[PDB]
Write a protein that binds this ligand. Structure first.
Ligand SMILES: [Zn+2]
Length: 162
């Protein structure tokens, strides 16, 4: 019911479509009036993703856009999983599904964590690629394994592959 605008960007992973309202970013989708630099969520999201890919050493300098997908508008374990992942798991780190489950308030709910991650509407920004099965097992990805491994390699992680 929000008044939605969209923008596209090029990335090493193909074209990304951003959609959002004045209250926040809604979605980042892999497709395979505002000026850049502005405070509008879509513009902040654009800036953040471009820095992620092209100036990753500066990534913490960039404002994280407000998020307004309906999954962020109400309390839930799914929201806890997404927000805790965003808040806690930094560029270049990973966390296991099981430790994220505990972080999000339900230790041992690994399958529910996986379901929440599959429903992440803002991939890369909320870093579902940094959630792994265990120390030697990168686990699965809603976007596909090759993408998960590529992102981890971009961030210099041991579990990265490209
Ligand atoms: Zn909205």
């Amino acid at each position: 019911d929000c008044e939605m605008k969209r923008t596209t960007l090029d990335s090493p992973l193909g074209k990304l479509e951003l959609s959002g309202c004045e209250q926040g970013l809604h979605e980042i989708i892999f497709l395979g009036a505002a000026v850049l630099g502005g405070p509008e969520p879509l513009m902040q999201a654009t800036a953040w993703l471009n820095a992620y890919f092209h100036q990753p050493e500066a990534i913490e300098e960039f404002p994280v856009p407000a998020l307004h997908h309906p999954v962020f508008q109400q309390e839930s374990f799914t929201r806890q999983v997404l927000w805790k992942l965003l808040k806690v798991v930094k560029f270049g780190e990973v966390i296991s599904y099981s430790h994220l489950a505990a972080l999000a308030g339900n230790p041992a709910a690994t399958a529910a964590v996986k379901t929440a991650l599959s429903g992440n509407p803002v991939p890369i920004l909320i870093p579902c690629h940094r959630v792994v099965q265990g120390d030697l097992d990168v686990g699965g990805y809603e976007g596909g394994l090759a993408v998960k491994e590529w992102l981890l390699a971009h961030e210099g992680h041991r579990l990265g592959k490209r």
